[PDB]
Amino acid sequence: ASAARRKEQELERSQEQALREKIDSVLLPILGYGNYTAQVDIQMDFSAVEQTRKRFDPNTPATRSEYALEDYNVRKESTRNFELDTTISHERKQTGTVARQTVSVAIKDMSESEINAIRQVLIGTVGFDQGRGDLLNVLSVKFA
Amino acid sequence: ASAARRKEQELERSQEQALREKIDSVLLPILGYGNYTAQVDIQMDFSAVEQTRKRFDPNTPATRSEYALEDYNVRKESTRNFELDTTISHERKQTGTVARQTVSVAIKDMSESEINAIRQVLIGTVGFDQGRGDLLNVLSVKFA
Amino acid sequence: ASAARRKEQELERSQEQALREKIDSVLLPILGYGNYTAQVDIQMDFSAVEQTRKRFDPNTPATRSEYALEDYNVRKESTRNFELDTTISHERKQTGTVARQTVSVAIKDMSESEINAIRQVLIGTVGFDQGRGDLLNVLSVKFA
Amino acid sequence: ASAARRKEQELERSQEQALREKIDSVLLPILGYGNYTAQVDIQMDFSAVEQTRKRFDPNTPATRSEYALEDYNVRKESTRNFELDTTISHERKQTGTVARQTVSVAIKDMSESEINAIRQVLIGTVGFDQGRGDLLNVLSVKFA
Amino acid sequence: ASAARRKEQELERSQEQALREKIDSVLLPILGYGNYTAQVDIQMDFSAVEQTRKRFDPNTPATRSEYALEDYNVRKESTRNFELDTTISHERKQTGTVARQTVSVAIKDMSESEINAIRQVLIGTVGFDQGRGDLLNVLSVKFA
Amino acid sequence: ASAARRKEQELERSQEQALREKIDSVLLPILGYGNYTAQVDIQMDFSAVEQTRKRFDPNTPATRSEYALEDYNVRKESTRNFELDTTISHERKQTGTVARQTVSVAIKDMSESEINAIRQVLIGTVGFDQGRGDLLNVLSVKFA
């Protein structure tokens, strides 16, 4: 029960560790050893979702049987059968999708252009996405 | 029964410990050894939620059988059958989701800008989220 | 359960590693050792989708049986049967399709034409596709 | 489950390797050793599609039984049966079809005619096809 | 599953190898060693198609039974049976048909007539067919 | 499955080899050693076709039973039975029929009459047939 849950926790940590390497592999040759520091956080969910969809197309009907009666003298009778396009889809979702991620970078003292360029580099280095509400902050402060 | 519950408690502590490392890895090189102190708290729940949804689309009907009678002289009769889009979803929730989290940081004596910058760094260092009603306080006081 | 999921994670890393070789095999002879740095990221999904389609062609009907009555004096009666073209398709999707990919390249200090040419080379070196919302950034910054 | 999927990945790499030989066998004697560089990418899918078609020909009917009544005095009655041409087709698709392919070639420094001729040679050397949205770029840049 | 698929790949390579010999057996005695280079590509499919056709001839009917009534005074009645020509065909397609093929030939430096003659020779040497959208390019470029 | 298919490939090669001997047995004593070169290609199919035909002769009917009534006063009634000629044919097609064939011959340097005569000889030497869209080209070029 709770034995497996702890394992899940460890997995999250692993993800963070991976990120903590990648940012280390890019900022080190450009900024320098001891002139930067950063940390990351990854939050995920472990739900279990299944979906079954069964759709129809009402705009394309096909007739199979038809009966009509038009007895004037005004008796009018009609009986028709139809066949429709059916689509069935069955989907199972993954377990462990990343929900949110936060990255913070502090640089020892910079102009606006340099910070913007470093942020642009980190955009591809990390993979920031605005759809998931991700967070990425880069700034320069005085060390001590 | 109660043997497993205690384990859950330990898990919470582990989470706090993790945070107590991350804040230590960022504030130490910028502020300095012995010039800061902080503690965290994490509160979670261990419920068990299952959901089953079965939705329909009323705006897209598809006809299958149709019978009509229009006997004037004004007898009018109609009988129709319909087919609708059906969606079935089954979801199971996780056990151990984080509900609230509190972070407090005290700095030995600072200007407003420095405190704001440190708070901004901690925002990404911790992962503060306003949706869950999280709490983060950073301030400077005189030590003794 | 969770034992296999971790394996999936490793697979993603492998993909990134492959890319980290290819960019190394092209930029090295043109730019030079120690004058560039780059990192990549690949995000995928592990869903399980099955589809079953059953289509009809309403514009091409074929008659099988026909009965008519035209008793004037105005009794009119008709009864027809039809046969239609039926197409049945069953599809199963893959597991592990690439969703998004980000590439970032920084070059030590360049004119606009050189950067454009390097980007064009990397376009075929990596395989950037705008349909998936892929990201590729190449820029030049001052190293330290 | 995931053990076989990795194998699929390896297969893709093999394809690329093959291409990386063919371009090496053509450009080497014409351009020269150390005056060119190139890389390729191949993306495929591993779906499983089955199709069953059952077509009819409505323009060519054949009568089998016919009954008629033409009682004047105007009773008119008709009843006919028909036989139609039926075609049944069952198809199974392959697994591992190539979807897209990208080729990029850089030549150390050229006139437009020479680049056009090299592109024309590579057209048959690789097998570029516009139907699949393939990509082939050849250009000349200054090396370092 | 995937073990046999790889074998299919090898088969394709074999085809190319065969072509790479035939062009070598014709161009070598006429052009000379070291004055030409060429490569080929063959793309095939591995589907599985089955067909069943059941055709009729409506223009040639044969009567079997006939009943008529011609009671004047105007009662007219007729009932006829027919026999028709039936043809049944069952076909199974091959696996591994060649879809497209590309040939590219470069000759070290030529007049238009010589290139046209070499192309004409290669037409029969390879078997170029316009129905399948085959590609054959022969040109002369300056070597280095 | 695929083991036998490869064998089929080998068979095709054998056919070509046979042709490569026959042209060698005719052109050698008339043209001379080292004054000619040629190659052939044979493309076949490996389908499986079965046919069943069931034909009738409507122009030759034979009466078996006949009933007539001619009650004047104008009641007219007739009922006849017929017997027809039936032909049943069952056919099974071969596997490995030759579809197309290409022959190309180059002669070291000729007048039009000599080339026409050599083409006429090769017509019977090979067996060129225009029904299958066969290809045969004979020409003279300068060797090197």
Residue numbers in the entry:
A (entry chain 2), B (entry chain 1), C (entry chain 3), D (entry chain 4), E (entry chain 5), F (entry chain 6): 255 to 327, 367 to 402, 418 to 452
Quote the study that presented this structure, word for word:
FliF contains three ring-building motifs (RBM1, RBM2, and RBM3) and β-collar in the periplasmic region between the two transmembrane helices. Among these motifs, RBM3–β-collar forms an S-ring on the distal side of the cytoplasm within the MS-ring.
They were separated into two classes in the 2D class averages, with them showing either 35- or 34-fold rotational symmetry on the S-ring. Consequently, we built the atomic model of the S-ring part (RBM3–β-collar) at 3.23 and 3.33 Å resolutions from the maps of both classes after C35 and C34 rotational symmetry corrections, respectively. The monomeric structures in the S-ring part from the 35- and 34-mer structures are almost identical (RMSD = 0.286 Å). Our S-ring structures are composed of 34 or 35 molecules of the FliFG fusion protein. Their diameters differ: the outer and inner diameters are about 26.0 nm and 9.6 nm, respectively, in the 35-mer ring, and about 25.2 nm and 9.4 nm, respectively, in the 34-mer ring. In our two S-ring structures, the 34-mer structure should reflect the native S-ring structure, since the in situ MS-ring is a 34-mer of FliF. We compared the Vibrio S-ring FliF 34-mer structure with three previously reported Salmonella S-ring FliF 34-mer structures where a notable difference is the tilt angle of the RBM3 domain. When measuring the α1 helix angle from the side-view of the ring, the RBM3 outer part is tilted downwards by 8° in the Vibrio S-ring, whereas it is tilted upwards by 6° or 8° or is nearly horizontal in the Salmonella S-ring. When comparing the β2/β5 sheet angles, they all exhibited a similar angle (55°) when viewed from the outside of the ring, whereas the angle is smallest in the Vibrio S-ring (58°) compared with the Salmonella S-ring (64°–68°) when viewed from the side. When focusing on the subunit interface of the RBM3 during ring formation, interaction was facilitated by two sites: an electrostatic interaction between E270 and K276 and a hydrophobic interaction between A399, V429, and L447 in the Vibrio S-ring.
